[PDB]
Design a protein around this ligand. Structure first.
Ligand SMILES: NC(=O)c1ccc[n+]([C@@H]2O[C@H](COP(=O)([O-])OP(=O)(O)OC[C@H]3O[C@@H](n4cnc5c(N)ncnc54)[C@H](OP(=O)(O)O)[C@@H]3O)[C@@H](O)[C@H]2O)c1
Ligand SMILES: Nc1nc(=O)c2nc(CNc3ccc(C(=O)N[C@@H](CCC(=O)O)C(=O)O)cc3)cnc2[nH]1
Ligand SMILES: [Mn+2]
Ligand SMILES: [Mn+2]
Ligand SMILES: [Mn+2]
Length: 159
């Protein structure tokens, strides 16, 4: 099973200038809980944005060019990325935009955080078709002293 996990600001913005400009610790904690002990697939730009391996997860990087760090696994195609995960129950695709586009048709589950923030960005989450997806979990949170925007955690499963 392939799942995508992402945090979206208004208008599906996910990034600007190879960064995420907001800071929502509760959402990073949600990301860690839902990815720990699973393989994570990311594109090369997202690998450079994170800047280090994510502990407790098999890190698989898509790039057309040879890898430059043996602390992670480098692959050259979608099919190779999936194969490198082995026989696990759930593969987590953690972006970015180009990678989400390619894995969306293959995904059975989306873990989405909707952030009430207006962000200029240069990268968007793919347009998906709402009729294809059932919302099975949602949890709204107001802003607090640690999280400066309101946010909604949602899990969707392909119908
Ligand atoms: N809000 C969120 O949830 C979230 C999550 C993740 C990322 N982001 C943001 O998203 C942005 C990065 O997204 P992006 O769309 O620019 O880049 P990306 O999807 O992270 O990386 C694209 C790169 O991945 C490689 N790649 C992708 N598909 C491939 C394939 N089929 N075969 C081989 N290589 C492949 C290529 O590397 P080469 O050029 O080396 O071939 C391509 O240039 C940043 O702003 C980041 O902060 C946000
Ligand atoms: N919901 C969601 N939020 C995100 O921030 C997110 N980020 C990415 C890609 N970028 C990043 C950037 C930083 C970390 C990070 O520092 N993670 C730590 C945080 C643990 C914590 O804060 O409690 C980790 O171990 O996962 C992960 C992914 C992909 N999907 C996402 N999905
Ligand atoms: Mn091939
Ligand atoms: Mn197998
Ligand atoms: Mn806001």
């Amino acid at each position: 099973m392939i799942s995508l996990i992402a945090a979206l600001a208004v208008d599906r913005v996910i990034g600007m200038e190879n960064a995420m400009p907001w800071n929502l610790p509760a959402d990073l904690a949600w990301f860690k809980r839902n990815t720990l002990n699973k393989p994570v697939i990311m594109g090369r730009h997202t690998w450079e944005s994170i800047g280090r391996p994510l502990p407790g997860r098999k890190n698989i990087i898509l790039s057309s060019q040879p890898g430059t760090d043996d602390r992670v696994t480098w692959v050259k195609s979608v099919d190779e990325a999936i194969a490198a995960c082995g026989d696990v129950p759930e593969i987590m695709v953690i972006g970015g935009g180009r990678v989400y586009e390619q894995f969306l048709p293959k995904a059975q589950k989306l873990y989405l955080t909707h952030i009430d923030a207006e962000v200029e960005g240069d990268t968007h989450f793919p347009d998906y078709e709402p009729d294809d997806w059932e919302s099975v979990f949602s949890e709204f949170h107001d802003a607090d002293a640690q999280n400066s925007h309101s946010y909604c955690f949602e899990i969707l499963e392909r119908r």
